Write a protein that binds this ligand. Structure first.
Ligand SMILES: [Ca+2]
Ligand code: NA
Length: 142
């Protein structure tokens, strides 16, 4: 049966964690950015190519080129549910007064999805979280 993947995220910028109810605030060398990926409906023990992208955002609209990208190879935990940490490290060249949002993609290394329904997987499982208006993935530099 085909896996039904879902991901949400929570960003931490410097010492400051965002949440469903408030974006993270960073006090005016670079900003340490860590994104937590909350996943369900992945395949236990399978490896995923995870790509995080940091964008400047203005009123829930992405502006300009990515400020940073980070990739990792992470393994799905028990029942294909759990949390991953994607550490971007220090991100240089962010601007005081500006807001940033994290986008995430995870693509399985193995074929985990039977897209043509012959009961044999032939497609990668791909999950995305690309919401420019998600305050839990957003931080502002004060
Ligand atoms: Ca197939
Ligand atoms: Na979230």
């Amino acid at each position: 049966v085909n896996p039904e993947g879902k991901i949400s995220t929570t960003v931490k910028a410097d010492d400051s964690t965002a949440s469903e109810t408030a974006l993270a605030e960073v006090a005016e060398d670079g900003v340490a950015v860590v994104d937590t990926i909350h996943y369900t409906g992945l395949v236990e023990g399978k490896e995923y190519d995870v790509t995080g992208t940091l964008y400047e955002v203005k009123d829930g609209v992405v502006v300009g080129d990515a400020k940073a990208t980070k990739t990792a190879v992470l393994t799905a935990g028990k029942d294909g549910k759990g949390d991953w940490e994607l550490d971007f490290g220090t991100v240089e060249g962010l601007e005081v007064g500006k807001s940033y949002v994290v986008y995430e993609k995870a693509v399985s290394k193995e074929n985990l999805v039977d897209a043509d329904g012959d009961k044999k997987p032939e497609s990668k499982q791909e999950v995305k979280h690309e919401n420019p208006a998600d305050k839990s993935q957003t931080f502002i530099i004060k």
